[PDB]
Ligand binder design. Structure first.
Ligand SMILES: [Ca+2]
Ligand SMILES: [Ca+2]
Ligand SMILES: [Ca+2]
Ligand SMILES: [Ca+2]
Ligand SMILES: [Ca+2]
Ligand SMILES: [Ca+2]
Ligand SMILES: [Ca+2]
Ligand SMILES: [Ca+2]
Lengths: 329, 329
């Protein structure tokens, strides 16, 4: 296999030979991309979700560590408003611990950056990367727009302070338009952060039926539909000629979950981290791209897709090999 | 604990004493109801979903068995159009095996009827009940309206053949209106079947933003919003003053998943089987209620709920004890 990770062959989204019953080459060409780069711990990706299980054996090596925090001293050493935020934060309780007690955030994290070639579990689009978590969704799914905003502000704070964080994964949605959320996203744009967002799983047209945050018109929002192992648009996926940008694998995605385990989930929530992961991989090759250049590169470098054509801006399905190639520098 | 099932105390939806961090008595009063009835295997509930793991140690005793089929003989002995449909069918492939290879259908099945007092795992609203599966969603989430209709038709076929199938659990949604699906549901009403449906997890109003199948106006459709351990409406729940009927526990629900395991999920998909389970438990006490009487009883016997008031027709949260009392013949 492309790596020595024992579950590699189940990862059709990264490499598809038809082994899960789909169509050969309906994938993002990850092994090809890995000949150029397998990623850098110096690239930081924020996951805004139910948290990140940074203790999972297949994520631990890629957990972000706050260089400005002394662990466990009960002091907010870097003065960012959260005490002892070594790996990220909990936006509900303000505790400096993004530990995932639900599962969803760990799953998306593994797709972005499960440790590669370590002989255990799976592997992310990046073999090496730094993942910082902000938990705004509780173990029972409880959360708020205010919480999501606290997360975005926190991540923007890290970036403004010099943390190399230019990609946010947002595998969540709900509610209507919020000016406060739009404004938080606008601030992230000024900080050069790409805001990747899931299109939703209700199989409707988002141009007629807006879904947030993917429908925010902010230029740095990159809205992702889900595709399957046959390169169809996933039957559950929402779409939108103007409001959704491109697609990526989200049907039957195996990844890390808490308690040192692995599980298969389906949703636009799973497509999103392939794209966030690809963005991080691109930034390991060309850090000089503006956010908009990065976004457009991910869109334009994808494979033309019959199902996504006319149902998304780019009509393409993610191809991280071509993204790296097109990224030069 | 109310039963000897080792995970019972995690099931706040059945019995809440604040042990999961919520509010004492924000629950459906299951232990109270069980003093009246713990269910009957003669009540049959259909689950239309990713399938049912009928081999799960905490579901096997309550898996429906088609009395009209000789297992494994390659013959459709009961002449219902499906070969060897012992526990139900796969509507994608037409094979008579609804085995869950995804997990979702098994999770909702456990909430309806995980075996009670068997010293294993969890317990459903019913300790004893018969659960038949129709799998229209694949391992990777692939499905279609055609598949859902095939499942409804299959269940209606069982009922019309003399099976005591009175309740359908539909913890799924997506797509636009389908007249053919509406017609399939009408056939189910004609057959005296209650069609329980999840309201959706996008925190929007279904009255202005229709969600299917929740928004079908069929009288036998019972549309369910999610509540949490504090008796709030779950932050993710969709609502609808006229298009959603009542609420039930859906935040942080522990139940059965395939591979002899247990997992905690959140969503209206988890609230739905509390109601489907309660419907079946009511029918063990008063089998003579009509579908519409049953629907109205579940809504009217619920506890008044401040959050759901003004956001659903009944403004109540499920109470199965009160349902059993109100149903007394
Ligand atoms: Ca390939
Ligand atoms: Ca290729
Ligand atoms: Ca700090
Ligand atoms: Ca500190
Ligand atoms: Ca109680
Ligand atoms: Ca009570
Ligand atoms: Ca048959
Ligand atoms: Ca047979």
């Amino acid at each position: 296999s492309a790596t020595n990770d024992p579950r590699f062959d189940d990862l059709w989204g990264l490499n598809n030979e038809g082994q899960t019953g789909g169509t050969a080459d309906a994938d993002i060409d990850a092994p090809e991309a890995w000949s150029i780069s397998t990623g850098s711990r110096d690239v930081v990706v924020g996951v805004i979700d139910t948290g990140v299980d940074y203790s999972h054996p297949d994520l631990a090596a890629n957990a972000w560590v706050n260089s400005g925090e002394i662990a466990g001293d009960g002091i907010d050493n870097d003065g960012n408003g959260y005490i002892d935020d070594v790996h990220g934060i909990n936006a509900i309780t303000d505790v400096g611990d993004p530990m995932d007690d639900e599962g969803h955030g760990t799953h998306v994290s593994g797709t972005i950056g499960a440790s590669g070639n370590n002989g255990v579990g799976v592997v992310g689009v990046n073999h090496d990367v730094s993942i910082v978590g902000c938990k705004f969704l509780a173990a029972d799914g409880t959360g708020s727009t205010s919480g999501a905003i606290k997360c975005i502000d926190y991540m923007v704070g890290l970036k403004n302070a010099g943390v190399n964080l230019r990609v946010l994964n947002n595998s969540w949605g709900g509610g209507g338009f919020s000016q406060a959320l739009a404004d938080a996203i606008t601030a992230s744009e000024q900080a050069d952060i790409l805001f990747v967002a899931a299109a939703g799983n209700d199989a409707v047209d988002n141009d007629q039926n807006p879904h947030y945050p993917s429908n925010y018109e902010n230029d740095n929002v990159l809205s992702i539909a889900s595709t399957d192992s046959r390169d169809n648009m996933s039957s559950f996926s929402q779409w939108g000629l103007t409001s959704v940008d491109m697609g990526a694998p989200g049907s039957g995605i195996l990844s890390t979950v808490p308690g040192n385990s692995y599980a298969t989930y389906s949703g636009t929530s799973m497509a999103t981290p392939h794209v966030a992961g690809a963005a991080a991989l691109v930034l390991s090759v060309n850090p000089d791209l503006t956010t908009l250049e990065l976004k457009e590169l991910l869109m334009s470098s994808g494979d033309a897709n019959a199902a996504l054509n006319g149902k998304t801006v780019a009509g393409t399905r993610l191809n991280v090999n071509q993204a790296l190639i097109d990224a030069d520098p």
